Design a protein around this ligand. Structure first.
Ligand SMILES: Nc1ncnc2c1ncn2[C@@H]1O[C@H](COP(=O)(O)OP(=O)(O)OP(=O)(O)O)[C@@H](O)[C@H]1O
Ligand SMILES: Nc1ncnc2c1ncn2[C@@H]1O[C@H](COP(=O)(O)OP(=O)(O)OP(=O)(O)O)[C@@H](O)[C@H]1O
Ligand SMILES: Nc1ncnc2c1ncn2[C@@H]1O[C@H](COP(=O)(O)OP(=O)(O)O)[C@@H](O)[C@H]1O
Lengths: 506, 217
C-alpha cells in the first residue's frame, strides 16, 4: 500500500502522488486511449533538506518498473565554453527519444532526477537565459514524446521560472514536512528490522518511549542514532554470537547526537559561564516576567508572535538573563544570533545568514530565537554617524512578520543604547520592554563577595566598613564587581587593591 | 471605495485611477484596502508587500516590480495593491538616507496608461504623509482617503462586545473607571486588540485592561 516499502510518515502525499501521476499508466491502454488524455510529465517536490525526497523518488521509480534513474545536480551542468553548458541538458533526452522512435507506444518508462533546481533555473529577463530556454524547448516542444518522467527537488520554490510551472511541464507540486510523533515511530519501525528478526535486539527497548524522546529529528538522524548505538554495543562487547543491544546503548547514542533543528546548548551554556547569583530582589522579578511571557506564547491562540526588548546600562549583565530565561523554558527550537558568528563576512553574506536563520524558524511547531546587541550588528559609530542601512531594514522587516500557518515564535533582543534606537525610529517593532538596573548599594556587594568567597569575614567586614565610610553612592555593574574581586584576590591585601579599585570604578 | 471600483469598471475615458489611503500608524489601512479589493470581482488581483522583497538586492527588487507591472498589462480588468511605500523605499530619518532608483521607478510607473483598451486600479497605503509631501510625489494620486483613530468610549464598548470580553459587568466597571481615569482617549484598533488579548490571560478583572489602556493612550 504505502509502507510495505521503506517510507514511513508520508501518507497523504503518497496518495496524492499515486492518484495524479500513476492513475493513467496502470489502466488498460484501450480505456485510456478512449478517454483521450495524455500523461503527466513532471513532478516537483520540495522541502527541508534530509527529509526523504530522494528515497521517495527512487521508490517511485522502482515500483513502476522503468530503467535506472539518471541523476544530476544543478551546479554541475555549467561549463565555460560557449555551447557546452546547454549540450549537457540536451544529452539527457537522447535515449528516450531513440527508444520512442524505434518501438513506439510500447516503450519502457524513463526517469530523470534533477537536484537543486533553484540554482541555475531562475527567472529569465547570459548563460542562465540560454539554459532556461534550452530546457523549456525540450520539456514540451514541437516533437511529441510521452515515455518520460522528470522529477525535481528543491528547498525554495519561489525562485523557479514562472513558465516552468505550467500544466504540461511541472504539473504536480508537493510539500514534505518534518515527521510527526507517529512518523518518528514508523521510521523507527522501518529502521530496526534487521536487528529484530535476526534476534540481536534486547527485549527491554520500548520504541514508543524512544520516539517520544526524539523531537524535531529529521529521519536521517534516526538512522545515525541506531547505527551508532549498534556500534557502541559491539565495541563494548569486544560470546561473539550472543551480542545484544540494550536500552543503555540507545540512550547514550541519543545523548551524543545533536539534531539540526534543535537546541544549541553550548552557546547558551558558555554565555552564562559566570553563574547566576541572586544578589537582590530584582532578579527574581525579571525571571518571573520572562516565564510569564514564555507561558503566554505557549498557551495562546491568536498571539502567534511576541517580540521583547531588554535594555539597561552597559555591563549590567543583560545577555545572561536572556540566556537563563531561554534555558528554563523547554522549547525544542532555540537559536542565537551574536556578533561573534557574523564577524569576518561581507555585507551580502551577513544579510544572507540573518535571513536564512529566520527562514528555518518557520518549519517547527514551537520556537525561540535570541538576538544579541542589535547595535553592533548595525555597525554604529557616533562620529558622522555611520551605520549600515541594509541590515537595519532587514531586521526591521523580520521583526514584524507573523510565522506562516499555525506556528509560534518569541523574539527576545538585548540592547544598551535606547536613545539611538529612539532616534532611528525603530521602537514601534517591540511589544514589551524590560529594564536591567545595576547595583546601587553595599549589602549587595557583601552578598556578592560572600557568594564568591573573596576573603574571610574579617577582611570583608573591614573593606565594607571602609567603603561605607568613603563611598556613599556606589554604582557599578556586576561584571566589573566580579573582575575587580578576582584582581584583588590575586593581588595582595584587601584594602590595598579592592577598596581602591572600587573607589576608582564608582 | 465601491464608487471608485464602479467608476473604473463601467466607463469610457477613465482607464487609470490612483488612490492614497493615509492615516496614523496602527489605524488599520491595509485591512480596509484588502476588504475593498475582495468585494469587487475583478479577474486579476495582485499585491506587493515588503514581506516578499525580503533579503533581495536592489536590482532584483526593481526587476520584480517591473515584472509585476508588465504582467498587469495582459488582462482586461485588473487591480493592484501596494503597501507602505515608505518601506519599499527604505527610509531612515537620520541623514536622511533612502533609495532613489526605486522611488523614481515607482514614480514613473504610477502614471503610465495600460496598452490598448485595458483598465487598472491602484491602491497604495502609507503612514508618512509629511515625508511624501517633502519628496514632492503627491502629484501622482487622483484622490486621498484618510483613516482616523478611535476617539470615544462607545467605540471601545463596541469593540469589547465584538471581542467577547466585557461580560456586561466588566463592560460597566471598565467604562466607568476610564470615564474619569482618562480625559483624552485615542488609540488604534491593532493596539486595542492586542491589549484585550493580553489582558484576557491574567486578572480578567477590569484592573489589567484599565492599566493597559491608560498606559497605551
Ligand atoms: N544576575 C546575575 N547574577 C550574577 N552574575 C550575573 C548576572 N547577570 C549577569 N551576570 C554575569 O555577567 C557576566 C557577563 O555579563 P554580560 O556580558 O552578559 O553582560 P552585558 O551587560 O550583556 O554585556 P555588555 O557589556 O557586552 O553589554 C557573566 O559572566 C555572568 O556571570
Ligand atoms: N475597520 C476595521 N474593523 C475592525 N478591525 C479592523 C479594521 N481595520 C483593521 N482592523 C484590524 O486591524 C488588524 C490589522 O491591522 P493593519 O495591518 O490593517 O494595520 P496597519 O495600519 O497596516 O498597520 P501598520 O501601520 O503597523 O503597518 C487586524 O486585526 C484587523 O482586523
Ligand atoms: N520517511 C523515511 N523513512 C525511512 N528512511 C528515511 C525517511 N526519510 C529519510 N530517510 C533516510 O534518509 C536518507 C534519504 O536521504 P534524503 O533524506 O532523501 O536526502 P535528501 O532529503 O537531502 O534528498 C536515507 O538514509 C533514508 O533511510
Amino acid at each position: 500500500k504505502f509502507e510495505d516499502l521503506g517510507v514511513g510518515g508520508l501518507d497523504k502525499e503518497f496518495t496524492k502522488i499515486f492518484r495524479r501521476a500513476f492513475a493513467s499508466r496502470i489502466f488498460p491502454p484501450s480505456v485510456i486511449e478512449k478517454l483521450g488524455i495524455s500523461h503527466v510529465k513532471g513532478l516537483l517536490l520540495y522541502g527541508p533538506p534530509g527529509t526523504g525526497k530522494t528515497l521517495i523518488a527512487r521508490k517511485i521509480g522502482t515500483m513502476l518498473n522503468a530503467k535506472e534513474p539518471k541523476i544530476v545536480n544543478g551546479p554541475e551542468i555549467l561549463s565555460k565554453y560557449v555551447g557546452s553548458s546547454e549540450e549537457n541538458i540536451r544529452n539527457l533526452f537522447k535515449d528516450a527519444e531513440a527508444e520512442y522512435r524505434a518501438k513506439g507506444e510500447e516503450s519502457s518508462l524513463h526517469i530523470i532526477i534533477f537536484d537543486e533546481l533553484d540554482s541555475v533555473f531562475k527567472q529569465r529577463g547570459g548563460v542562465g537565459d540560454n539554459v532556461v530556454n534550452q530546457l523549456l524547448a525540450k520539456m514540451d516542444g514541437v516533437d511529441q514524446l510521452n515515455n518520460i518522467l522528470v522529477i525535481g527537488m528543491t528547498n525554495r520554490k519561489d525562485l523557479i521560472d514562472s513558465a516552468l510551472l505550467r500544466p504540461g511541464r511541472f504539473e504536480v507540486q508537493v510539500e514534505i514536512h518534518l515527521p510527526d510523533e507517529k512518523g518518528r515511530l514508523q521510521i523507527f519501525d522501518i529502521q530496526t528490522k534487521k536487528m529484530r528478526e535476526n534476534n540481536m535486539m534486547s527485549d527491554d527497548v520500548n520504541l514508543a518511549e524512544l520516539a517520544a524522546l526524539t523531537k524535531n529529528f529529521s529521519g536521517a538522524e534516526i538512522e545515525g542514532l541506531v547505527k551508532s548505538a549498534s556500534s557502541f554495543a559491539i565495541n563494548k562487547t569486544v560470546d561473539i554470537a550472543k551480542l545484544k543491544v540494550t536500552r543503555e546503548d540507545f540512550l547514550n547514542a541519543l545523548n551524543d547526537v545533536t539534531p539540526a533543528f534543535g537546541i544549541s546548548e553550548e552557546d547558551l551554556k558558555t554565555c552564562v559561564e559566570g553563574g547566576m547569583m541572586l544578589y537582590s530582589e530584582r532578579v527574581n522579578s525579571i525571571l518571573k516576567n520572562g516565564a510569564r511571557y514564555v507561558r503566554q506564547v505557549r498557551e495562546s491562540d491568536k498571539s502567534r508572535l511576541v517580540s521583547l526588548l531588554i535594555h539597561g546600562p552597559a555591563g549590567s549583565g543583560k545577555t545572561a538573563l536572556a540566556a537563563e530565561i531561554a534555558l528554563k523554558s523547554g522549547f525544542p527550537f532555540i537559536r542565537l544570533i551574536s556578533p561573534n558568528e557574523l564577524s569576518g563576512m561581507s555585507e551580502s553574506a551577513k544579510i544572507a545568514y540573518i535571513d536564512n536563520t529566520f527562514r528555518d524558524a518557520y518549519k517547527s511547531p514551537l520556537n525561540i530565537l535570541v538576538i544579541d546587541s542589535l547595535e553592533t550588528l548595525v555597525d554604529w559609530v557616533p562620529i558622522g554617524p555611520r551605520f549600515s542601512n541594509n541590515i537595519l531594514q532587514m531586521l526591521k522587516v523580520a521583526l514584524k512578520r507573523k510565522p506562516p500557518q499555525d506556528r509560534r515564535l518569541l523574539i527576545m533582543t538585548t540592547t544598551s543604547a535606547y536613545s539611538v534606537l529612539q532616534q532611528m525610529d525603530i521602537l514601534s517593532c517591540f511589544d514589551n520592554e524590560i529594564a536591567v538596573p545595576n547595583m546601587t548599594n553595599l549589602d549587595e556587594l557583601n552578598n556578592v563577595m560572600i557568594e564568591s568567597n573573596f576573603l574571610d569575614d574579617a577582611g570583608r567586614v573591614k573593606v565594607i566598613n571602609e567603603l561605607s565610610r568613603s563611598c556613599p553612592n556606589f554604582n557599578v555593574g556586576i561584571k566589573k564587581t566580579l573582575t575587580n574581586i578576582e584582581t584583588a584576590r590575586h593581588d595582595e591585601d584587601p584594602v590595598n587593591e579592592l577598596v581602591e579599585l572600587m573607589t576608582q570604578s564608582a
